[PDB]
């Protein structure tokens, strides 16, 4: 997609070489923002084929508050495999913080339910926020939340969402991150009888891995195809009652998939 390729090029042009936790090395910029008007189409990267089924199942999984990968494995989704322990656990990552953020009282806050209620009851609120950045639980997590903090906004009957992503593997992660949040916005907008507005993506450490460079140069040579259209085939009774079969992506005409290794 145009903004995605622009970002990729910017990292090449303006990124600094920078070592990384994984061992591999990156070109990195700090601070970036892109906007996707979800009325223009569903922002699924077309310059390579993305594994939408993994994106859909992963979001459904977050929404269930699940942090054991058994569900992903039941649906043949492997993107979380490297960080799961022997029992399939990842610790209290996104799903847990989204549905059951823990507090001293032995209490738990369902941020997704809260945000739904704000959207329905108080859409003008300026604190329609979900955070996965539970400082007190970070060391229990297999991996620190990357898509850390997001906020919704309503105007002119349209639901917008801004994500703050602290760290972004532009080649592997970002297409998943964009589509996942774009999908959540549609779902939430459906539940709240709103139209979809913008997804605003904001990045912190935004990088290309040194061993994704061939892939990146290949992708940059490709022309973006028109955005597909997301169809939701029914209206589940709540944001928690969706199933994989509810979604169809129409007119997704991507260029071929490009293989690249995840830096563990």
Ligand X SMILES: O=C1CCN([C@H]2C[C@H](O)[C@@H](COP(=O)(O)O)O2)C(=O)N1
Ligand Y SMILES: C#CCN(c1ccc(C(=O)N[C@@H](CCC(=O)N[C@H](CCC(=O)O)C(=O)O)C(=O)O)cc1)[C@H]1CCc2cc3[nH]c(CO)nc(=O)c3cc21
Asked whether 203 and 31 are in contact (CB, 8 A), the reply is yes
Of 126 and 259, the one with the shorter C-beta distance to ligand UMP is: 126
Asked whether 83 and 143 are in contact (CB, 8 A), the reply is yes
41: Cα within 13 Å, side-chain hemisphere: 17
What does the alpha-carbon distance between residue 251 and residue 205 come to, in Å, rounded to a whole number? 32
Binding flag, residue 167, ligand UMP (CB under 6 A): yes
Binding flag, residue 176, ligand Y (CB under 6 A): yes
- Binding-site residue numbers for dUMP are 21, 126-127, 166-169, 177, 207-209
Question: What is the closest distance, in whole angstroms, from the C-beta atom of residue 211 to ligand Y in the complex?
Answer: 9
What does the alpha-carbon distance between residue 205 and residue 165 come to, in Å, rounded to a whole number? 8
What does the alpha-carbon distance between residue 152 and residue 137 come to, in Å, rounded to a whole number? 24
Binder to ligand X among 21, 107, 233, 259 (CB under 6 A)?
A: 21
Binder to ligand X among 97, 162, 177, 191 (CB under 6 A)?
A: 177
Question: What is the closest distance, in whole angstroms, from the C-beta atom of residue 229 to a copy of itself in the complex?
Answer: 23
What does the alpha-carbon distance between residue 175 and residue 182 come to, in Å, rounded to a whole number? 11
Beta strand 229-232 with 16-18: parallel, antiparallel or unpaired?
unpaired
Is position 146 annotated as part of the catalytic site? yes
Binding flag, residue 34, ligand UMP (CB under 6 A): no
* Interface segment toward ligand Y; rule CB under 6 A; list 4-12, 63-71, 172-180, 245-253: 172-180
Task: Name the nearest CA neighbour of 165 among 152, 178, 183, 184.
Answer: 178
Identify what 78 binds: Mg ion, ligand X, ligand UMP, none; CB under 5 to 8 Å per kind.
Mg ion
Question: What is the closest distance, in whole angstroms, from the C-beta atom of residue 37 to a copy of itself in the complex?
Answer: 11
Of 198 and 205, the one with the shorter C-beta distance to ligand X is: 205
Binder to Mg ion among 39, 78, 117, 221 (CB under 5 A)?
A: 78
Binding flag, residue 168, ligand X (CB under 6 A): yes
Binding flag, residue 160, ligand Y (CB under 6 A): no
Question: What is the closest distance, in whole angstroms, from the C-beta atom of residue 172 to ligand X in the complex?
Answer: 7
Binding flag, residue 166, a copy of itself (CB under 8 A): yes
Note the helical H segments in the chain.
Answer: 2-14, 52-63, 70-74, 94-100, 111-121, 173-191, 213-220
Q: Which residues are catalytic?
A: 146
Judged by the rule CB under 5 A, the positions of this chain that interact with Mg ion are: 78
């Amino acid at each position: 997609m145009k903004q995605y390729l622009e970002l990729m090029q910017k990292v090449l042009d303006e990124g600094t070489q920078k070592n990384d936790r994984t061992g591999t090395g990156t070109l990195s910029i700090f601070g970036h923002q892109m906007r996707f008007n979800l009325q223009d189409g569903f922002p699924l990267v077309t310059t390579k084929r993305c594994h939408l089924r993994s994106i859909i199942h992963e979001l459904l999984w977050f929404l269930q508050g699940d942090t054991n990968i058994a569900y992903l494995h039941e649906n043949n989704v492997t993107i979380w495999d490297e960080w799961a322990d022997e029992n399939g656990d990842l610790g209290p990552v996104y799903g847990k913080q989204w549905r059951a953020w823990p507090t001293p009282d032995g209490r738990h806050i369902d941020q997704i339910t809260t945000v739904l209620n704000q959207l329905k009851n108080d859409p003008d609120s300026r604190r329609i926020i979900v955070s996965a950045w539970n400082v007190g639980e970070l060391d229990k997590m297999a991996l620190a939340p990357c898509h850390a903090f997001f906020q919704f906004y309503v105007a002119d009957g349209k639901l917008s969402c801004q994500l703050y992503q602290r760290s972004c593997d532009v080649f592997l992660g970002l297409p998943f991150n964009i589509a996942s949040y774009a999908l959540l916005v549609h779902m939430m907008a459906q539940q709240c009888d709103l139209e979809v507005g913008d997804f605003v993506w904001t990045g912190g450490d935004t990088h290309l891995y040194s061993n994704h460079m061939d892939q990146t140069h290949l992708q940059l040579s490709r022309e973006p195809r028109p955005l597909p259209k997301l169809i939701i085939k029914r209206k589940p009774e709540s944001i928690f009652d969706y199933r994989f079969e509810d979604f169809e992506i129409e007119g997704y005409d991507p260029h071929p998939g490009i293989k690249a290794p995840v830096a563990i």
